[PDB]
Amino acid sequence: FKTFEWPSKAAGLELQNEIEQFYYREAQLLDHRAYEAWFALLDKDIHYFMPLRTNRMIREGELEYSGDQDLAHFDETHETMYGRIRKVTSDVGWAENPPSRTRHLVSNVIVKETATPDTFEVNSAFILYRNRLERQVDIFAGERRDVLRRADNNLGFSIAKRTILLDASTLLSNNLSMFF
Amino acid sequence: FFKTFEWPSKAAGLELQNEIEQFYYREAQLLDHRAYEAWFALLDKDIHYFMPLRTNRMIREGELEYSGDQDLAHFDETHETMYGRIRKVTSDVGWAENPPSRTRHLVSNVIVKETATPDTFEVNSAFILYRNRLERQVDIFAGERRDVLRRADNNLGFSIAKRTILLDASTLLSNNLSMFF
Amino acid sequence: HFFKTFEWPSKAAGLELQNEIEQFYYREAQLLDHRAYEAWFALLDKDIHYFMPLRTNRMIREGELEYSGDQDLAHFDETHETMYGRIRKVTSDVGWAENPPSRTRHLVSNVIVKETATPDTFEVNSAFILYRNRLERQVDIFAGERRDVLRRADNNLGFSIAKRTILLDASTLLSNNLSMFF
Amino acid sequence: NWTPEAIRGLVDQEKGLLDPRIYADQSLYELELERVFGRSWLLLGHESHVPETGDFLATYMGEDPVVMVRQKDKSIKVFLNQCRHRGMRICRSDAGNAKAFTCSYHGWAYDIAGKLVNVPFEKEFDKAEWGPLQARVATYKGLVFANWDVQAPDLETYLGDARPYMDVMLDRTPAGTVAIGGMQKWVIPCNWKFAAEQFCSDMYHAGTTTHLSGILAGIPPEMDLSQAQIPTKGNQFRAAWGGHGSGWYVDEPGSLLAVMGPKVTQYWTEGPAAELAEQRLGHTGMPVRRMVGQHMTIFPTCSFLPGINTIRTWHPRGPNEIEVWAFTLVDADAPAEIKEEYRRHNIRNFSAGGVFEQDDGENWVEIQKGLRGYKAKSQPLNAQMGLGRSQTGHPDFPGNVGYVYAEEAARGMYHHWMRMMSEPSWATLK
Amino acid sequence: NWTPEAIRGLVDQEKGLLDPRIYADQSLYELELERVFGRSWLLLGHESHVPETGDFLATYMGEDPVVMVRQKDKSIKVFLNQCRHRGMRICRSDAGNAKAFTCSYHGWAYDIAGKLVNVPFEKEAFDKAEWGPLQARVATYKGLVFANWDVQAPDLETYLGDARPYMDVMLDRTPAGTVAIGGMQKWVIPCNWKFAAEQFCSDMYHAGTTTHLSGILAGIPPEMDLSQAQIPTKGNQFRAAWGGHGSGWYVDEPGSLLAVMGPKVTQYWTEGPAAELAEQRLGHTGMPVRRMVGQHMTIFPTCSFLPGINTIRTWHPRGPNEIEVWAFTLVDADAPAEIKEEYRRHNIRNFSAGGVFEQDDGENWVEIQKGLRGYKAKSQPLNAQMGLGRSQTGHPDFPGNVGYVYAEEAARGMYHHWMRMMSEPSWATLKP
Amino acid sequence: NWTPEAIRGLVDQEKGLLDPRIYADQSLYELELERVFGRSWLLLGHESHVPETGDFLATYMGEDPVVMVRQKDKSIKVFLNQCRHRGMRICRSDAGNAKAFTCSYHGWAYDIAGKLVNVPFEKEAFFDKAEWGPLQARVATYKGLVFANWDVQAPDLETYLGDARPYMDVMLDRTPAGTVAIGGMQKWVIPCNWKFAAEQFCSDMYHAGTTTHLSGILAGIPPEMDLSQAQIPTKGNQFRAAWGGHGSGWYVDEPGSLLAVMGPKVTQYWTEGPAAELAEQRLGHTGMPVRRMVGQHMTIFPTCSFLPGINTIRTWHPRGPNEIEVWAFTLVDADAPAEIKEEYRRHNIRNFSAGGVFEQDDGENWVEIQKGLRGYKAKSQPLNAQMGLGRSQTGHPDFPGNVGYVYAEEAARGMYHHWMRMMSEPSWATLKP
Ligand SMILES: c1ccc(-c2ccccc2)cc1
Ligand SMILES: c1ccc(-c2ccccc2)cc1
Ligand code: FES
Ligand code: FES
Ligand code: FES
Ligand SMILES: [Fe+2]
Ligand SMILES: [Fe+2]
Ligand SMILES: [Fe+2]
């Protein structure tokens, strides 16, 4: 996947702010389980992808991430995300009932200027703290790469792509009942 | 219930956003360097410092996740009771914190909301609190904080009128909460 | 040789400048988390001091002795030349600790900016969590603060590093090594 | 298996010596779960935790997930949170109200009584035969206890002569007590016997060095330790049978004031409510209004401080760990101002962040860590305090009584511990 | 020490009973390592994982780290990933291509066969042919690679027995055969392997009741809900004559498969020339592959698959209380591009750690093992009586021992075979 | 239960085989604490760690925490960091100066000697103070280094060290001013058995001269130089103790090792000039070419390891069969120039610490070894330790004692034989030399 190609023309403070604020707004939605409103932020052409990651020798570094013809943790369009939302809000979805207590701590937000006006590629680091039941604690760290198109919504933006690069080979958690 | 933070339609100006984020970074620097009297000075005389107990509930009962204002809590404090805790943590004979822990308060997700009173702001934020002590003991806490901050001619720019911490834990995995959130 | 609350300026740094420092750190975190060691090493000025003191359990009264001094052993105490060799090691395919490489995440927040006696030079305070995952199930989590001296530079990040001190929240290191950069 | 004679070698009450291995040995803990915890009466909470039909509280009986739930006929039966099909947890949440319990794994349905009512595709073995294992339920003035053993003596017989000492906390009004909303839980990396014994026999820690900072916390800002009065007067109780014990101060008002504050100290010592409590418990012939700082342990893991009114269960969780489950009791008719005071002071002092509890736990943690070493488990620990000075002819307090700074109740707890896993049948354990 | 009598009492196949200690006991686990895992045929993956010379895959046999590597002579060798000098791992990456294997510690060099070829300073300071990593037996069944330490154990074909026709349902549909889609998803579940082994062996009962109600809802059209989606009922359950293998499937009910795999995958599986060629190839036992919808199977002890969905996995044990799930997806090598892509999409959507079906699976398993820490949770036996005395060996539709789909005869036999493997020291009695 | 017959069948020095179960078995470890650690001489630190009256260092002997504290009579006492009332820790900081120690639980008070001097309410309750409080350890010093042992029947440090002594003097007795520790004690956790670490510094020059440190050498060599241009030393010798499990290895006449690690200035100080030749005269009784000795390693059984050229020294603290703690520090000559001290300090941080370009790689190997041993087949067959077998001889002109080639495992076999011997033989009448 390589180093995020940040724009050398450092993004405007005005926009830098509303992009970060959007993510914080989005984080607030996810941790408070407002799934209906969080889904609405995803455009029709959305690609929700989270590849597998492997231990590779330096000489075989290009094969670290699973490809677009491989299995992955997540590889979702619009109708596939829709299905997950139906489950995650469901009363008979017992992986999230009782609900988990989660924290989406978000920083390292980089917004990228493209040629298209009102479209900006966005990188972010995250730590996701998952506590559930009595004593289960799952800690996740990684990055999220997004496109983001300027919209007239409550959060100010819509998501048309999300790639989650997780910092794990074998997943130390029993499941991924949460959203990243 | 608490639920999602009612964020204002117009984003806070870049000056105010900076001021409040900088406040939290400063507060964290005080706590992380054990400047307890300096930290205590931020608390207004009418402070309410609150950390409810959190339980596992089915969707049919989501309203009862957090404990109420008449229930037991991890913290439920006035200016006076908070000062007692400061006395204990700064005491040479406070064994829980002498030798002291080593803590880091990482602060993010800062959302600023205006009030009906000028110079007063309601703030939402996220934290990870990393606590290391003794030889090898590590406790990691995560959650959200909901504050009322008043502009103040102090060292940090604001004073703390109210604090609610929602901790992402049922049973506490840590043996104590000798830290301040 | 002690450390206390960072001495932030009473006048908070300009919003434009605050953002530039924040973004620079996000970019630095990107280089390291993607193992672009050569590009990261290019950020280090020739007069770099890279310091991570030992930290010990002391009684409140002996507080001034918590950290190791400039004539004591440390976890890191580096110059440009010693950092060069470390970069040479981590990029080497016979460097077993990082071949296969670790998977790291440097999460940066709490950025506090202070001007110095030199124009375009800044004393910077920041907090971090470093999450390191390697091999099959190995997880090492570090938290701490960094105290930096940054200089404006004509590179793709906007700044260069003249000094770095890392205060790590650990006495005994819970990791089997420190093969990563902070 | 540990031989019954080797088990008897661990605790010697006559010499006043203890074997450190009791706090660390893995195989002794396995025996504990079966012999000690599988046949004792264990606290699951208060009747107010579930006052209406269908109201439940998921709790523990030493590693066993257990669920306690109110019924239509006002009963509150407790069964295993385990579905005998493939062992899945029946009830998924800590508390609430249920109409029926449905297993998420294969859909075995249950009423609130625990009885198996519906099995999917059962027409394609009796339904009443395969329901979760029901425990014995017995209450003591609001306190709900449970026991797996049908051979075990009833609750009243079990508690015995230490009932008047519980009556100090639970029977001050005809209205009864009510549990305040909320139950706090936290993990301590120590053995349960450190926590049980301290509340049973250790006032010596509070009278010396452990709570110096906690006293400082409850004292006025202008006042320091040099102005705080050091308590030296009081006695120590030992139960006849059960593994129960107590210690308290006599004529030291300042000790309670530093913990609970003015209004609660007043409420406990002077006035209409305080005097009504002296006449209701008058039949015991105990000077209840001069009693301060009392600590108590109902064996094995039910501990509380009368006056302060914090109450907790210590959960097994292995030889090197416990889970503390604490809540607070207030009298039902008590003023709205007093209830708020009792709530606030319990949180201030005896919680995971509590200014007393912090230092209690810190001793145990560091002790358990040290016991990892071989030599640290090699020599005996001193448990002599007040050796042979506890005579049974004291004019003020009933039972076996000694000086407050002694370890007589400690030896009574470990004696019964030893016994409750060296004696298999109830025919001798009575 | 665990006496042979004590083991036999842990499983009662006649009364359909289960002693819950088998999921929790520490000393029973360490015996499992020897008695079960140290001499069973264990899934390491597919031939397509290692398609060329020198291609390797670091995997596990129980808790033993192993290297599976394709040779010059196109054979697959499996050896212990352990430098026999001082125990160092010889192959330190997950997957890739090697010309050699060198120990990073003192520089002992190995060839791709696992032969020791070079020792630094050997002339200045014993036979290399005797000191290579320990080798395992390697056998394949229609694409799947199995391995075994015990030379005295039966071969793979005899090990499987009459369970082979149900394996063939997934593996033998076309002469071109199966090929793995790239990627080996791995996650850790704090539950014992037997729970998961059992589920895919016998437990169709969980999918048709409550566990997958939500995952079904995710694979149903937005305009439609759970009511207008019958809850499969009719179907069968198979037990292998020896080995504790077991399978289960629905008959004539597409609702289970349609939800999971969509319209296009179902059409490929049940209709057209491909599904006809599949039934053509499997006519050896006269079983209709068109009518078998949403199959599940476990090959003892830790191999599990879902022929219709085409997901396959190994449960790696890590003590009594935790496992590592290593899973991948299979497709017919000749299938169209759209069919392969739909297989990939729908497997990621449904059976990975974040899969709308798999999420609920672990959630149940985690909870059971937690409860099993209790003494009373380990006191009374578990229930495994479903379908007792409702299966015979003679059906005009299905070969071998066949019962109702929501039975637990296959489960009883799995524990029965486990019981036998734990208690019988010599293969002189264990083998058929 | 492990029978003495079974314990002897774990190690065989004749065949040169090691049973891998010695690094993994939980019940074998529980015996190690009793039979090895509770009876061995263990490093605690240096005399310069506790210089003035009341100075203390909180450390370990096995898993048992101890306080090492300088007495008013200028001696040094070691006692168990545990109050014999209810087991509380008596000394609660890493290091410092104490006038007295006081238990925080019930306030039992102790003097700097570790004696019980006050018991609160000792008149209302209770018994003699002189008889209670923490178990004491035997203390012995060796030219700056401080050692300790619990067992009263065990041999004295001098007899314990025996033939290994002269090989320590290469680091310790360079000047009449003696050695002083640089400030700082680095501490870190490695999930591996202690025997791997102990063996490496005992006998394993073989890892340094082959693959482990190819990247470490690359880090220290001139930036203009490449690995193939750098030249690995090949000549040198190894030592096995007459008794104990001790051993040392070193290169001769090839400074390529030392130069890459320590740099030119330090290499000059060690080999050329007024101070380097003064050391040669002081070690005149041994008759060793100390100036030609470049790049040396040594282990004092069981846990005291050090590199006389680099001057790093450490104790391996055991934490179960699958974990250790490394407690490391650095020594310098008391009268060595300021620039030389600063170079010793900088190069030790650079190479031999948790982040050290050398140490990073040693703890990569040991960690991956331990993981493997969780599997059944991984513990089924013996490991190989046969290098230089029947090749080491006692009558060497250049060096005193049993000497072999630099790439041997004779010290390795000698260490594991004494492990077997301690594990099997219950009484000292049999074990003592
Ligand atoms: C075990 C595991 C999965 C299934 C299964 C679930 C959905 C559709 C088809 C089979 C049956 C048993
Ligand atoms: C054991 C430990 C370290 C070394 C060593 C490392 C670098 C240079 C010379 C020797 C040899 C054996
Ligand atoms: S486990 Fe409760 S229904 Fe299967
Ligand atoms: S461990 Fe592989 S060569 Fe020494
Ligand atoms: S523990 Fe040291 S006196 Fe009680
Ligand atoms: Fe206390
Ligand atoms: Fe399932
Ligand atoms: Fe090394």
CATH label of the domain that carries residue F52 = 2.102.10.10
Q: Which ligand is nearest to the CA of E313?
A: 1
Tell me the shortest Cα–Cα distance from F361 to chain E, in angstroms.
Answer: 9
End-to-end CA separation in angstroms for chain C:
21
From the list F164, F180, F182, the residue with the least C-alpha distance to F172 is: F180
Which tokens is E245 given? 């293998």
Within this chain, do residues D393 and D316 fall inside the same structural domain, yes or no? yes
For D103, half-sphere exposure in the C-beta direction (CA atoms, 13 angstrom radius) is 33
Nearest 5°: the CA angle E366, E372, E373 is 105
A48 and A74 Cβ atoms separated by less than 8 Å: yes
Which tokens is E394 given? 């003679």
Which residues in chain B touch residue C112, judged by CB atoms under 8 angstroms apart? 22, 25-26, 29
Which residue, by CA, sits nearest to atom 7 of ligand 1?
E207
Look at F377 and E134 and tell me if their CB atoms are within 8 Å: yes
Which tokens is C132 given? 């390191």
State residue E82 phi and psi, 5-degree precision.
-155, 110
| E strand map for chain A | 48-51, 72-76, 101-113, 120-132, 136-146, 149-150, 157-158, 162-166
E278 and E242 Cβ atoms separated by less than 8 Å: no
E216 and E259 Cβ atoms separated by less than 8 Å: yes
Which residues sit opposite C140 in a β-bridge? C132
Which amino acid type is present at position F9? G
- Reported as type and span, the H/E element at residue F315 is strand F312-318
Report CA-CA distances (Å) from A127 to A35, A143, C33, E264, F317: 20, 9, 14, 38, 34
D390 and D401 Cβ atoms separated by less than 8 Å: yes
| E strand map for D126-202 | 136-140, 143-147, 177-179, 184-188
Tell me the shortest Cα–Cα distance from A87 to chain D, in angstroms.
Answer: 15
Nearest-angstrom CA–CA distance, D179 and D163 = 19
Interface residue B5 vs chain C (CB under 8 A): no
Within this chain, do residues E396 and E354 fall inside the same structural domain, yes or no? yes
Within this chain, do residues D363 and D419 fall inside the same structural domain, yes or no? yes
F297 is in an annotated binding site: no
Measured in Å, residue D105 CA sits from the centre of ligand 7 at 9
Nearest-angstrom CA–CA distance, A154 and A37 = 9
- For chain A, what percentages of helix, strand and coil (3-state, to nearest 5) are there? 25, 35, 40
Nearest-angstrom CA–CA distance, D136 and D149 = 8
Nearest-angstrom CA–CA distance, F196 and D195 = 40
Which residues sit opposite B162 in a β-bridge? B48, B148
Within this chain, do residues E142 and E189 fall inside the same structural domain, yes or no? no
CA dihedral of residues D419, D421, D422, D426 (deg, nearest 10): 70
For residue E343, give every residue at least 6 positions away whose Cβ sits within 8 Å of its Cβ, in sequence order, or none. E181, E261, E265, E310, E329, E331, E335
Nearest-angstrom CA–CA distance, A166 and F372 = 26
Look at D374 and F64 and tell me if their CB atoms are within 8 Å: yes
Q: What residues line ligand 4, using a CB cutoff of 6 Å?
A: E 83, 85-86, 88, 103, 105-108
Q: Which ligand is nearest to the CA of D132?
A: 3
Tell me the shortest Cα–Cα distance from A116 to chain B, in angstroms.
Answer: 24
* Residues present in chain E in total: 432
Nearest-angstrom CA–CA distance, C11 and E94 = 53
End-to-end CA separation in angstroms for chain D:
24
Using CB atoms within 10 Å of the CB of residue A136, give its burial: 0 to 12 exposed, 13 to 18 middle, 19+ buried: middle
Q: Which ligand is nearest to the CA of D92?
A: 3
Which residues sit opposite D298 in a β-bridge? D302
Which residue, by CA, sits nearest to atom 2 of ligand 3?
D83
Nearest-angstrom CA–CA distance, B22 and F243 = 65
B29 and C8 Cβ atoms separated by less than 8 Å: yes
Q: Please count the residue pairs, one from chain A and one from chain E, whose beta carbons lie less than 8 angstroms apart.
A: 143
After which residues is chain D discontinuous, taking C to N > 2.5 Å?
Answer: 124
F415 and F2 Cβ atoms separated by less than 8 Å: no
Nearest-angstrom CA–CA distance, E283 and E165 = 10
The three-state secondary structure class of F229 is coil
From the list C72, C182, C84, the residue with the least C-alpha distance to F357 is: C84
Nearest-angstrom CA–CA distance, E242 and D315 = 45
Supply the CATH classification number for the domain C1-182: 3.10.450.50
Nearest-angstrom CA–CA distance, E313 and E180 = 12
Measured in Å, residue E380 CA sits from the centre of ligand 7 at 25
Which residue, by CA, sits nearest to atom 8 of ligand 1?
E294
From the list D358, D383, D370, the residue with the least C-alpha distance to D320 is: D370
For residue A31, give every residue at least 6 positions away whose Cβ sits within 8 Å of its Cβ, in sequence order, or none. A102, A103, A104, B144
F406 and F249 Cβ atoms separated by less than 8 Å: yes
- Other beta carbons less than 10 A from residue C11's beta carbon: 7
Within this chain, do residues E107 and E250 fall inside the same structural domain, yes or no? no
Nearest-angstrom CA–CA distance, B109 and B103 = 20
DSSP secondary-structure letter at D388? T
For residue A81, give every residue at least 6 positions away whose Cβ sits within 8 Å of its Cβ, in sequence order, or none. A39, A42, A46, A48
Within this chain, do residues F334 and F198 fall inside the same structural domain, yes or no? yes
Domain coordinates in residue numbering, chain A: 1-180
Within this chain, do residues D150 and D279 fall inside the same structural domain, yes or no? no
Among F2, F369, F377, most E C-beta atoms within 10 A, so best to mutate, is F377
Could you check whether the bond before residue D395 is cis, i.e. omega within 30 degrees of 0?
A: no
Nearest-angstrom CA–CA distance, E128 and B106 = 55
C171 and F94 Cβ atoms separated by less than 8 Å: yes
The three-state secondary structure class of D150 is coil
H runs (alpha helix) in F209-353: 214-220, 256-262, 264-271, 274-282, 338-351
Domain boundary among the residues E160, E178, E195 is at E160
Within this chain, do residues F251 and F394 fall inside the same structural domain, yes or no? yes
After which residues is chain F discontinuous, taking C to N > 2.5 Å?
Answer: 126
Domain boundary among the residues E131, E160, E189 is at E160
CATH number at residue F301: 3.90.380.10
Q: How many helices (H) and strands (E) does chain A have?
A: 3, 8
Which residues sit opposite C78 in a β-bridge? C50
B178 and D353 Cβ atoms separated by less than 8 Å: yes
Which tokens is E302 given? 């830790």
Sign of CA dihedral F79, F83, F86, F92: negative
Within this chain, do residues F23 and F65 fall inside the same structural domain, yes or no? no
The three-state secondary structure class of A73 is strand
* E235-261 burial: b if 16+ Cβ within 10 Å, else e: bbbbbbebbbbbbbbbbebbbbbbbbb
Report CA-CA distances (Å) from E11 to D3, D44, E193, F15: 29, 34, 17, 45
Total number of domains constituting chain F: 2
The three-state secondary structure class of D345 is helix
Interface residue A135 vs chain D (CB under 8 A): yes
Which residues sit opposite E56 in a β-bridge? E69, E96
- For chain D, what percentages of helix, strand and coil (3-state, to nearest 5) are there? 30, 20, 45
The three-state secondary structure class of D69 is strand
- For chain F, what percentages of helix, strand and coil (3-state, to nearest 5) are there? 30, 25, 45
Q: What residues line ligand 5, using a CB cutoff of 6 Å?
A: F 83, 85-86, 88, 103, 105-106, 108
Which residue, by CA, sits nearest to atom 1 of ligand 3?
D86
Which tokens is D314 given? 């210590």
Within this chain, do residues D288 and D380 fall inside the same structural domain, yes or no? yes
CA dihedral of residues F287, F288, F291, F293 (deg, nearest 10): 180
State residue D175 phi and psi, 5-degree precision.
-70, -30
Nearest-angstrom CA–CA distance, A147 and A112 = 9
SS (H, E, C) chain E: CCCHHHHHCCEECCCCEECHHHHCCHHHHHHHHHHHHCCCCEEEEEHHHCCCCCEEEEEEECCEEEEEEECCCCCEEEEECCCCCCCCCCCCCCEEECCCEECCCCCCEECCCCCEEECCCCCCCCCHHHCCCCEEEEEEECCEEEEECCCCCCCHHHHHHHHHHHHHHHHCCCCCCEEECCCCEEEEECCCHHHHHHHHHCCCCCCCCCCCHHHHHHCCCCCCCCCCCCCCCCEEEEECCCCCCEEEEEECCCHHHHHHHHHHHHHHHHCHHHHHHHHHHCCCCCCCCCCEEEEEEEECCCEEECCCCCEEEEEEECCCCCEEEEEEEEEECCCCHHHHHHHHHHHHHHCCCCCCCHHHHHHHHHHHHHHCCCCHHHCCCEECCCCCCCCECCCCCCCCEEEECCCCHHHHHHHHHHHHHHHCCCHHHHCC
Supply the CATH classification number for the domain B1-181: 3.10.450.50
Within this chain, do residues E152 and E182 fall inside the same structural domain, yes or no? no
Nearest-angstrom CA–CA distance, F414 and E86 = 16
| Residue E380, domain extent | 1-39+161-432
- Other beta carbons less than 10 A from residue E79's beta carbon: 23
- Other beta carbons less than 10 A from residue F85's beta carbon: 21
Nearest-angstrom CA–CA distance, E325 and B44 = 53
* D269-283 burial: b if 16+ Cβ within 10 Å, else e: beeebbeebeeebee
Closest-CA residue of chain B to D356: B88
Q: Are strands B158-167 and B43-52 parallel, antiparallel or unpaired?
A: parallel
D296 and D310 Cβ atoms separated by less than 8 Å: no
| Residue labelled with tokens 């149903």 | E220
DSSP secondary-structure letter at B12? P
| Residue labelled with tokens 């090699």 | D378
Report CA-CA distances (Å) from D361 to D195, D321, D322, D407: 8, 12, 11, 19
The three-state secondary structure class of D216 is helix
Which tokens is B106 given? 């990482």
D249 and D234 Cβ atoms separated by less than 8 Å: yes
- Other beta carbons less than 10 A from residue D100's beta carbon: 11
Interface residue A141 vs chain C (CB under 8 A): yes
Which residue, by CA, sits nearest to atom 1 of ligand 5?
F86
Nearest-angstrom CA–CA distance, F252 and F261 = 16
Report CA-CA distances (Å) from E419 to D250, E10, E28, E41, E411: 65, 7, 11, 17, 12
Measured in Å, residue E211 CA sits from the centre of ligand 7 at 6
Which amino acid type is present at position B23? F
Q: What residues line ligand 2, using a CB cutoff of 6 Å?
A: F 200-201, 204-205, 208, 257, 261, 295, 297, 307, 358
Report CA-CA distances (Å) from F208 to C87, F47, F192, F235: 20, 31, 19, 13
Q: How far is CA A11 from the centre of its chain?
A: 21
Look at B127 and A137 and tell me if their CB atoms are within 8 Å: no
The three-state secondary structure class of B80 is helix
Look at A108 and C108 and tell me if their CB atoms are within 8 Å: yes
CA dihedral of residues B39, B42, B44, B45 (deg, nearest 10): 40
Asked whether E and B share 3 or more beta-carbon pairs under 8 angstroms, the answer is no
Q: Which of F205, F221, F254 to mutate to test the pocket of ligand 2 (most atoms within 8 A of CB)?
A: F205
Which tokens is F250 given? 């070193």
From the list E39, E27, E5, the residue with the least C-alpha distance to E421 is: E39
State residue F325 phi and psi, 5-degree precision.
-115, 130
Resolution value (Å, 1 decimal): 1.9
Which residues in chain B touch residue C6, judged by CB atoms under 8 angstroms apart? 29
From the list D408, D310, D306, D319, the residue with the least C-alpha distance to D356 is: D310
Which residue, by CA, sits nearest to atom 7 of ligand 2?
F208
D11-12, strands of its sheet edge to edge: D11-12, D17-18, D381-382
For residue C8, give every residue at least 6 positions away whose Cβ sits within 8 Å of its Cβ, in sequence order, or none. B22, B26, B29, C112, C114, C125
Within this chain, do residues D181 and D71 fall inside the same structural domain, yes or no? no
Nearest-angstrom CA–CA distance, C97 and F355 = 10
Domain boundary among the residues F145, F161, F177 is at F161
Which residues sit opposite A126 in a β-bridge? A106, A142
Q: Does domain A1-180 have CATH number 3.40.225.10?
A: no
Radius of gyration of chain B (CA): 17
